[PDB]
Design a protein around this ligand. Structure first.
Ligand SMILES: [Cu+2]
Ligand SMILES: [Cu+2]
Ligand SMILES: [Cu+2]
Ligand SMILES: [Cu+2]
Ligand SMILES: [Cu+2]
Ligand SMILES: [Cu+2]
Lengths: 336, 336, 336
């Protein structure tokens, strides 16, 4: 595929939305290969991660933790414009696990504050993939400061089950799970700092215990609950993309299932079926497809329940519709 | 199906047995869909989890850690009478990962001391599934106090491998693996408590380290050894169902293999074959089918060997039969 | 086979090479079943594992951490002469996860210093498999002192994909991954000891935290980087065997992929494809097949990036050939 051929390809500017929502895209590919264009500005900002007012100096793609989901189709080109404003203090870059060469793009995208860059790569393999910042010598620090996201490379023909039947979701959500390592003082109280770099040494010591102080979805404890609870209706088919750029996770839809789960995140690997709890290793994304059958609230969790309910890794679904007494019924409600 | 059609179905009352054993069942379903009735009384009890006498207040389905294995076939209904006696001190409920709606059943089964409830759900998918107590605001604590078990939903046609060939076991065992988090004093010695609640605060601290003090099969270090060692014979086909409601495990039969392993625990997902070590993520059950070929003693372990041999996650099998020198032989015994 | 048939099989002595290199072998078996003979001498020695002079009393098959890769074909026999020199201080043995009976061989190979032993086993199942020392009552201690390696049991007809098309590698590397648990004094300085057994009690205390001090490839921080980077050329097909005898890992080729990954390490289990990050549970080996498409430096890591970049679990590949701008191009280089 020649430079001339690539330059002749149609282009499409895409407008990214904040997780857990996903920008407008089509499941089945519309026409031949294109160059899909994205722009993200890096925001270094304080985020409050729990109800005790614990802060993290987030290093945030598009200003969010996680960074937003980019959707392309197999054999499209993803062309990202990454911007590091003068109002930042650190060098940043970006590695796409979906990309091939130069460490996933990080070797070609190192930008000081004030600089920008434009990277283009061919999305040759279908699936969900992590992307994350990885500056040489400070890789884990940037990743666990929230500097990671994910992309989805859909097949041209959209999603299919193991045996070739089409799988079409009505809804898609992107859950980015984040392990945070927040230093404490001698009273076991979390510390605050004036600059990202001020926390480095204290944080690194915590990182080395391999024990996160917080494990959260969408940047904070309770982030995807209440006003930000995910929604569905009985009969709706929903795709849940889940990433974790540094640490293992075991997602589980409480009250539901993973009807089809690409646990590895890769669409050419046939999915697992009828899943109670799936497993996504650190440095990967997975995706699960589920048709809701019951109304009510669901909890969506990392099913190490200490991580879910002590450390923060719990989100809700609010589902509307009619209760099914065949699937489940209270024959005798709680009573003496 | 309608309420009338479910009412017309035959009902079978099952007598549960204590782990690692499993109640009488047939592998291939007998007749059409049944309503399968189980009763479990919750017992808040002091249990000893090691040879030193370290004690935990178990919150125990049917009085055991793990709770017993319930066995039904696909499209059967599981009807559970759950009873929380007046002598208990906490509210409990049950979540069936196999079930659909109301958080797996937890939203419909919250019973205080002196209360009972009857939950029915349709067993729509074949596999092994975790069940566990999950009271809102107190979820992980009930689980890591041993309030969990598993069920198996057999395919109506019994087990098959990935290519449609039937797999009939001679015997089945259920290994519930438990992570315990036991408070220590300033000498590093484990603390005892008067009531379940008294332990709460100290325990949650240990829980947050994500580092169990004990990792055990059937409620205690060495519980499945000595005259409680599991047993087999050369040529015998054994299904080992393994569950972990809170934390990852990596089961390994030392001296053997997992000939067919549904690592995800779901029978519609083709099993892995010829396994040395398989992986079960916290909040799931898996199952391994193995035909014994050599006599002698085997250790069945979680293959983090520190967890197996320091923390308690080791069981034995005693196997009768003739040694196969073709498979293995000492050409030269330990000698100068 | 019959007694005479086994006795009549060819015997072939093979010379081992140190990891990450692998001894001469054919992918397609050459002739009928063979008794493949190997010799390993056990070395107990102090090794430095980091840039700060930190020591471990290594317990090392063939004098290396990991022990060397042994390569046979399915239904060959592996015949190991294991030697424990009189200069050593500890009893050792060997467990092959690939073998059937006597705990994988440990029961038949317990050799005191001044002793040797010859074990033969039939390699009945194709795959990569952990081996490790395992003396009753001191199993994890020998393993986390580096006394572990792997073997590869190739299909007689070499490797295939899920469709049965041949996969032939140009090169094979073996990355053995090691969790070390090095004691520290109260100032946080790593302690040193005169003999292996002097470190035992302190080391077990560190092991029980389940938190390694170091996670390394080939026995040391940086052992497979710089001038010891592994090598390839664009268009070369490489198999990467990876083992972890005690603890989970999640291998990732930074800048590349795992085109075919036998994550379970078993060749009769179809490989996953297009992998970003794969998962190998503690107590197993896995294998990844990749065709390099881009020149330059790659980082091969455990993608818990803290383990990779704080704790030592990072390797390099140095790759020759011509850049492919179709796959990846810098449209605009880092600029103000
Ligand atoms: Cu960054
Ligand atoms: Cu990465
Ligand atoms: Cu309970
Ligand atoms: Cu659950
Ligand atoms: Cu040893
Ligand atoms: Cu082992």
């Amino acid at each position: 595929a020649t430079a001339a051929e690539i330059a002749a390809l149609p282009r499409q500017k895409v407008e990214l939305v904040d997780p857990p929502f996903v920008h407008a895209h089509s499941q089945v590919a519309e026409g031949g290969p294109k160059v899909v264009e994205f722009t993200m500005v890096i925001e270094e900002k304080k985020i409050v991660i729990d109800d005790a007012g614990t802060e993290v100096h987030a290093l945030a793609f598009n200003g969010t933790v996680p960074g937003p989901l980019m959707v392309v189709h197999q054999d499209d080109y993803l062309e990202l414009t990454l911007i590091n404003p003068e109002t930042n203090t650190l060098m940043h870059n970006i590695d796409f696990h979906a990309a091939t060469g130069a460490l996933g793009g990080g070797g070609l995208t190192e930008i000081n504050p004030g600089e920008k860059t434009i990277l283009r790569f061919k999305a040759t393999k279908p699936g969900v993939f992590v992307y994350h910042c990885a500056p040489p010598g400070m890789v884990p620090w940037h990743v666990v400061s929230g500097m990671n996201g994910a992309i989805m490379v859909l097949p041209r023909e959209g999603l299919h089950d193991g045996k070739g039947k089409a799988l079409t979701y009505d809804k898609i959500y992107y859950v980015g799970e984040q392990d945070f390592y927040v230093p404490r003082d001698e009273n076991g109280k979390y510390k605050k700092y004036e600059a990202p770099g001020d926390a480095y040494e204290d944080t690194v010591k915590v990182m080395r215990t391999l024990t996160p102080t917080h494990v959260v979805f969408n940047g904070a404890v309770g982030a995807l609950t209440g006003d930000k609870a995910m929604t569905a209706a009985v009969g709706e088919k929903v795709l849940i993309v889940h990433s974790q750029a540094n640490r293992d996770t075991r997602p589980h839809l409480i009250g539901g299932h993973g009807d089809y789960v690409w646990a590895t995140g890769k669409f050419n690997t046939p999915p697992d079926v009828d899943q109670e709890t799936w497993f996504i290793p650190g440095g990967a994304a997975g995706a699960a497809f589920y048709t809701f059958q019951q109304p009510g609230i669901y909890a969506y969790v990392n099913h190490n329940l200490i991580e879910a309910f002590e450390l923060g890794a719990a989100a809700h679904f609010k589902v509307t519709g009619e209760w099914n007494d065949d699937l489940m019924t209270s024959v005798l409600a709680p009573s003496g």
